[PDB]
Amino acid sequence: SSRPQKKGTAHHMKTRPKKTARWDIKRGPAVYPPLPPLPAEWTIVS
Amino acid sequence: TKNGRDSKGQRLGVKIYGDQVAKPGAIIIRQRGTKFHPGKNVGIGKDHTIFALIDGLVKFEKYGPDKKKVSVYPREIQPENPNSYRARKRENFRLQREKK
Amino acid sequence: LSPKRTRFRKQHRGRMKGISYRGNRICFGRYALQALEPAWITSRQIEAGRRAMTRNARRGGKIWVRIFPDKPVTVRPAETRMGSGKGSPEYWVAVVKPGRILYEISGVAENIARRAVAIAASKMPIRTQFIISG
RNA sequence: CAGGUAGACAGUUUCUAUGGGGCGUAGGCCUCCCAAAAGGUAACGGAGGCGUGCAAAGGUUUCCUCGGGCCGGACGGAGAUUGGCCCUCGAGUGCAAAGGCAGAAGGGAGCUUGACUGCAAGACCCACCCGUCGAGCAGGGACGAAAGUCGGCCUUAGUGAUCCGACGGUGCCGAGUGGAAGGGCCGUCGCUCAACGGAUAAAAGUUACUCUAGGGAUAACAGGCUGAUCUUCCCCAAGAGUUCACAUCGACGGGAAGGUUUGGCACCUCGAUGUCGGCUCUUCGCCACCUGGGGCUGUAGUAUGUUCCAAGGGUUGGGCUGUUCGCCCAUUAAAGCGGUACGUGAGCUGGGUUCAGAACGUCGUGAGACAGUUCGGUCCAUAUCCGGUGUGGGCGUUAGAG
RNA sequence: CUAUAACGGUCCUAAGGUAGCGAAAUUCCUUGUCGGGUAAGUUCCGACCCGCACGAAAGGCGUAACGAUCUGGGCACUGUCUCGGAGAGAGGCUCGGUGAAAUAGACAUGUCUGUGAAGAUGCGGACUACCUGCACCUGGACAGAAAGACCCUAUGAAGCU
RNA sequence: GACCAGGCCCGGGCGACUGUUUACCAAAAACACAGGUCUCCGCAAAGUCGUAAGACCAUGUAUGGGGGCUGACGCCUGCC
RNA sequence: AACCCAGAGCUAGCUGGUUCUCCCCGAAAUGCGUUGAGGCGCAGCAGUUGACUGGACAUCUAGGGGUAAAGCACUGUUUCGGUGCGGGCCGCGAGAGCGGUACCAAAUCGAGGCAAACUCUGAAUACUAGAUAUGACCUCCAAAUAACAGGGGUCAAGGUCGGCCAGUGAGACGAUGGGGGAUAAGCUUCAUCGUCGAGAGGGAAACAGCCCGGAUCACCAGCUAAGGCCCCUAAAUGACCGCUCAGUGAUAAAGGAGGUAGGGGUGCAGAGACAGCCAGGAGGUUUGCCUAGAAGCAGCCACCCUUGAAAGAGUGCGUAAUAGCUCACUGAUCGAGCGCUCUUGCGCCGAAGAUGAACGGGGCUAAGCGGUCUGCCGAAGCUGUGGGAUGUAAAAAAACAU
RNA sequence: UUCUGGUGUCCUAGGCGUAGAGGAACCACACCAAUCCAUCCCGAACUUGGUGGUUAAACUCUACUGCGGUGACGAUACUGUAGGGGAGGUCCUGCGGAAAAAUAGCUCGACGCCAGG
Q1: Structural domain of residue C38, as residue ranges?
Q2: Which of B6, B65, C47, C89 is 20 to 30 A removed from B22 (C-alpha atoms)?
Q3: Which helix (H) or strand (E) holds B97?
Q4: Which helix (H) or strand (E) is C93 found in, with range?
């Protein structure tokens, strides 16, 4: 035989989810245009 | 049944590197034999170690095909000081010992 | 096979590296056996491949064994495992890295050297090919 | 009172790293590598030495260049001593290696005793103890004409703290005083305290008659990782097979799978995982002994040899041994190999982790001991739950039933 | 002729094992080889002597009688067995009385497979299981006991030499 | 005719034998034994227990009293 | 070596245990030494109180190296060719002058290789130091609004030397550099680093060490990292290029293969290229040896030329040997692609275990694998809105860091 | 103000070899003798005192890349960080640094002081 089985934390460096597609690493979050600031949350009315 | 485990633990080496401020009597090189020959303003030791005679920097230069020549120069360099973080440290020591 | 004089009896191992840029060329002979695979080749596989291609040429031509082992491998006995006492007169080992020429042959025609070098590549733990003298 | 003198008796010691042992090895110092280009750095990793030696092999002044090949010279040759050229550091340095050192630190000659005293700014190394270097000052010198150099050796190893004792010496203390006995201080000596940071000035074994506090930190049984070893298969083909590598074996080599042997690690378990064999009783794998189908055959037919699919079913009764294994007899279609912690001792019994008694051989001075042999030698248990085999009762099945 | 050693020399000791025994309670190789017994005999008996590692009062070699001694074989005899079967009691099952115990973190306490301190009802996926008793069986709960007698550690204890 | 009431023979090993032995896992091939041999002991004996006095030995006297080893009986028991 | 009492509450470097809350900080499993190894003393690394300090993190520059790579200039070691110091035998009838030699070997040259204990060389990093450079926030400010810069204020952070005072000194895995091993182990020992230890959450089906990430607390808030978007289970049965037909999609190799999608070379064709049918395949000749025969077909040696459109002392079978069947090659009919090598991408076989799908499940020819484009889901991360506490800090408020 | 010749220092270390030149001055060999001095023997070396000729040896200057020394650029191995593949040995990417060997070349040194003519 002479093939070692990959045990714990060697199983984790092999069988962890790795996204090995060079496209899907390039993705940043989407950017919307900036909006004007929202008004005050409330106002004193006397 | 092994005939081993005969370590030694002994240490040597370059103590003060080039362009560094030396002291009178400061051991520049601890060496086995002479990798570094004594130039000027230095002295060789009883076990061929190189110590400095005067203050100043140390340098290295060839005088043959391989040799190295530890030397010492008097170092009258650099009066100007644009350091400004340290004055903020001492000035904040003053402001904290006057604030409370 | 085995060096006569040894400067040091036991010698520890050493790891394979990239493509050997020196021993990749062909010095003598017309055909060669270039190795693509870095491992160890003992003198035992060299005797096997040497008898294989010498008796596969068998009429004319001469082969060229390039490599010599020059390092030992100490196999400890079954004595419950703590020491590396004596394993030095045991099997010798040649380091081969990719690119390196293992065998050469001359005086042989095309397909007789293809079967001579190609059959003797089955006596060997690493994948190879045969190379013409370009 | 003094000498000798019995484990008769008493108090004790009997190291550790380790392979967690008889059978070994090592313990301290130095050099290279491992050591990954500062320094450091471990393993029962790879190689060696040291426990000194020198009145010069220390100091100073001065001179000189070795080492090897070639050529010449009836002793004398390959090689002694001598002459000449070539290479120029390959020789040498009291001894191991490393780093050094060519008008030298290598060899010779003269004079010599700094192989002194009192020291010492500053550094390195740095748990501490230690250990290493040192400019510079005074005295008194050695060499040299002087300049200057000399506080041992080209360097790194050649060693040991403390308590105590001893010798030589001293303007120190002298238990009322003067002394003295004794003690300091200084210079040195005495340890293979070698298990070398040294337990004491002084210390070996056995326990199966044992006992306690612990450990899975640590072995055995078993599981897990590994697969060197083992089983099985496959790649190449020098051959053997009257010719003929591949009907059948296949040397020299190579590549795998399995976890069934012996191993390696010590990861769960020692406030307890009960090993080997047998009986009873399963179940599962196929790497097929037979049964069923087929290919090839150096298959004329019978019987085969090898191989493919196929694990439904079977795989005997015995003599020996505690036996697994194995040998033999009578056969049989064949008398398969293994997993399930010996598969299975909360289902059951013998050899054994050989328990306590005894004997033989051998070892030991002995107590005792042997992976030597033989005789005898208590093995517990009312099922809580899961699991199983049977057998109900309730309720549900959309009204209730047979 | 193949052997084997009557016999010889040499080294070292204090001396180099005498009679008898001898794969033995002693023999590792070894189930040594031969013969007997058996259909078949690692056990037994009789021999050879290559006695790892017998041996002459730690006695050696024998033998009548004796032994809840060990061991080999044979006759008679039988459920030991092939290969079980029936019957009688005391339990076990049911009813009425009396009525514990070891054990116990709480238990709403499945199987496979995988993972995990590397042997999981408790974690993951799937499948299977209405609830709850009674009578049997003991594979698991690393079941109960009991701070492992074996192994190692302790600058532990004790006996003995 | 119930209950009661020897199974036996052929070999070998060890221990001569009847006995004793680990109360509660070993009854033996172990211990003892009759017999043998060595050695000590002259009585105010040796030896044993006790600092001592003394006691057992022994109210006995080498055909007796200790102690060591072996284990009837038959043949012997070698060399250093 | 009895039992009871007493010393005695013996001793235990060993085991178990040691009880209320909140806030801030926060390790170590290393070295040295040890009759020591599971103990301890010191150092390293905490807490608190200070005293000196001005650094940390980025960038640049300078120093010594001898590791990786590399190389044969030294030390070895090694493959081959030539000249080959010298030997091997035939040898002569001898004090011997030198004759015979396709054979083995010191030395050099050339072509080559290897080495931890080899270095003519020599990095990248790392170490020591020097040098350059405001880390956020609030506010004022040039008639002033932007912006540059400035004035003031607040906060955060480094190190050395101490005082008091602890633990820790069994580490584990992962990447790199190695030694032991068998370059086997979740193995053992080191050197730098990351995590766990002492770390919650999300992804990993489950699962300490793998990736993201650092949990003060609340919200039935939003945006994201790692990773995902058929259903179980949140988000795309999203778009466009190619591929796979084995459920590969979890798996292991040597080796085999007209598998399929390409890509690079080289050789033939409209003077007919490949595949099949048909025709020819002959003369010397049975080349010369052997054999009874060997006529191409048991074999040995070369292995011809001629007619020609081409024929090989033959490619295989067969025969006692022949004869003969047949092929490499050429001729003829239809006709337009055919070879033979390297090579990737994804595949096939090789590829077989013992209780039962066992590879998250269902399943899917895409919901699989490669290349881009847009969005969404996705943590206790961040943001937002509100509290609490600690430090500045010495009252409150407010601020920044935590 | 060049040469000459005692002197150093930086040095890429500047050397071997093939060629040409110098004796007005200088430096250097050669002949004669030995008083201080001297060689484990020799006036070979060293010293003193003179004849004083030559460049022969030795020094100095100018050329050559035939050896020797030095040595690129580009590449490439390697490596720091950030990652990926493989069962393992081990390999491949982004950015930064960057070899060695070989080769093209470079090199028959360069700066100062003092005394002549």
Answers
A1: 21-134
A2: B65
A3: helix B85-99
A4: strand C92-96
